[PDB]
Design a binder for this molecule. Structure first.
Ligand SMILES: Cc1cc2c(cc1C)N(C[C@H](O)[C@H](O)[C@H](O)COP(=O)(O)OP(=O)(O)OC[C@H]1O[C@@H](n3cnc4c(N)ncnc43)[C@H](O)[C@@H]1O)c1[nH]c(=O)[nH]c(=O)c1N2
Ligand SMILES: NC(=O)c1ccc[n+]([C@@H]2O[C@H](COP(=O)([O-])OP(=O)(O)OC[C@H]3O[C@@H](n4cnc5c(N)ncnc54)[C@H](O)[C@@H]3O)[C@@H](O)[C@H]2O)c1
Length: 432
């Protein structure tokens, strides 16, 4: 049994950014521990679907350890031990008892805390959840952690020059199809929805990327579903069978069909809301001294007066700082302001790069140049509900053009005329 005043459960992005805030708040040696099932100190997870997979000049640890992804300093394992912050790596907690403040690992080790910070992130939904035949064949890969990224880098070198199938049309589907393409793979994207990124992209935004990906040689099969996989004698995947009977040849298969908050250790012990652990504006759960941050928390999104859950890296960084300030603030009888978050999402693929700020509610208006064969495409979209701008998307924008649409999403300016908004386009944001 090891006791610590503060225990961060998980060693991902929120854990690393909470550790940075703890050091900034004068944490003392022996006070804080980070328990992680990963063998490495916290890192900027977004690099795993991008830089990590490049055929040349690839991103490797320790380069992308936190907090460099936000322009902060690198926190190598020594950053922690110099401060008396115990990193407990390769340790998976299989039981958590909030009533006795005890965490129990797979090997039966126990750890106690005074303050717990749940930062377990998201699970990887696997094709077994839909009873897909052959989903256990070798080379049917998923991407969540650095070990998955290493197994993917190796399968890429092994099957290079061959055929890849990507099941999923979300973030992983779009980013991984691009990764396999640049790695000399013949890629097919498969997903059941009528267009890519259905939870964010309109049919018009999606159509730009479908045409773009097609010209790069990526076959995008909309309205398609994988129902099985063929495998050879060694058990390696050889093909992907679709609901319509079409069979695609596959040397490697990559799947991105969503993630769920990794809350399994606390079911029945914390209040929940839409899959996540329900928190207040300071990330404290229904149990005093227990906080939940990043991907697992369903917190009040102040701007929209609703409880929301965000499974993106910007929120994992901002929520971590909020919970640590809330814990340290209470120790001095002080209160900190409520979390005031502006949902910020982004994706990168090929020579493209988009940003989204706010909420994708109401009706949309496409602006700019959305031609996929243009050398420098720049186009965006606005989301309008109740006469005001709620959301703003922009592909190919400059730093100041991205901050202009972010300003629009924060301030929710009124739209007296949609005809004028369509006519101004990106200038509506740049002016305001
Ligand atoms: C490959 C890939 C690529 C991207 C992204 C995700 C993925 C999977 N994201 C999403 C973003 O990385 C994500 O929102 C943050 O990692 C969330 O930070 P957390 O700390 O909440 O979870 P995160 O998953 O980072 O950390 C959870 C940690 O808890 C550990 N853990 C869980 N259960 C445990 C247990 N029982 N015992 C011990 N340890 C345990 C995990 O092993 C991990 O170390 C993204 N977002 C974005 O906006 N832009 C981007 O470009 C990307 N790119
Ligand atoms: N740039 C980024 O923001 C980025 C990049 C990579 C990963 N991520 C994060 O990592 C996590 C995993 O991403 P993801 O792409 O797996 O999730 P996702 O939620 O973005 O997309 C999964 C998509 O696959 C669809 N799908 C579900 N079942 C399917 C099936 N049987 N066949 C095909 N498609 C199916 C879903 O409806 C959804 O559209 C998420 O939390 C995501 O936000 C984010």
């Amino acid at each position: 049994e090891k006791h610590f005043k503060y225990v961060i459960l998980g060693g991902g992005v929120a854990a690393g950014y909470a550790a940075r805030e703890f050091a900034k708040q004068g944490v003392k040696p022996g006070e804080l521990a980070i328990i992680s099932k990963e063998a490495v100190a916290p890192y900027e997870r977004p690099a795993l679907s991008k830089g990590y997979l490049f055929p040349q000049n690839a991103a490797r640890l320790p380069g992308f350890h936190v907090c460099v992804g936000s322009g902060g300093e690198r926190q190598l394992p020594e950053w922690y031990s110099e401060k008396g912050i115990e990193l407990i790596l390769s340790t998976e907690i299989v039981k958590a008892d909030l009533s006795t403040k005890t965490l129990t690992s797979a090997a039966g080790a126990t750890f106690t805390y005074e303050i717990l910070i749940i930062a377990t992130g998201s699970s990887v939904i696997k094709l077994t959840d839909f009873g897909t035949q052959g989903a256990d064949s070798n080379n049917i890969l998923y991407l969540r952690e650095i070990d998955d990224a290493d197994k993917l880098v190796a399968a890429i070198q092994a099957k290079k020059g061959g055929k890849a199938v990507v099941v999923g049309g979300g973030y992983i589907g779009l980013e991984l199809s691009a990764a396999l393409k640049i790695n000399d793979f013949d890629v097919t994207m498969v997903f059941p929805e009528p267009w890519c990124m259905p939870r964010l992209f309109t049919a018009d935004i999606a159509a730009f990327y479908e045409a773009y990906y097609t010209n790069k040689g990526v076959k995008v099969l909309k309205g398609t579903l994988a129902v099985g996989f063929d495998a050879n004698a060694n058990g390696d995947v050889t093909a992907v069978k679709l609901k319509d009977g079409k069979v695609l040849e596959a040397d490697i298969v990559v799947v991105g069909v969503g993630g769920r908050p990794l809350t399994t250790l606390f079911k029945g012990q914390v209040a929940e809301e839409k899959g996540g652990i329900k928190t207040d504006a300071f990330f404290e759960t229904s149990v005093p001294g227990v906080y939940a941050i990043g991907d697992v928390a369903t917190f009040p999104l102040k701007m929209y007066n609703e409880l929301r859950r965000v499974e993106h890296v910007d929120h994992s960084r901002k929520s971590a700082e909020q919970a640590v300030k809330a814990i340290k603030g209470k120790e001095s009888g002080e209160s900190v302001p409520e979390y005031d978050y502006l949902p910020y999402f982004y994706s990168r693929s090929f020579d493209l790069g988009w940003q989204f700020y706010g909420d994708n509610v109401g009706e949309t208006i496409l602006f700019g140049d959305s031609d996929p064969t243009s050398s420098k495409p720049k186009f965006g979209s606005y989301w309008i509900k109740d006469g005001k701008v709620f959301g703003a998307f922009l592909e190919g924008g400059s730093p100041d053009e991205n901050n202009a649409i972010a300003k629009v999403a924060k301030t929710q300016p009124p739209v007296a005329s949609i005809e004028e908004l369509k006519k101004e386009g990106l200038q509506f944001a740049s002016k305001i």
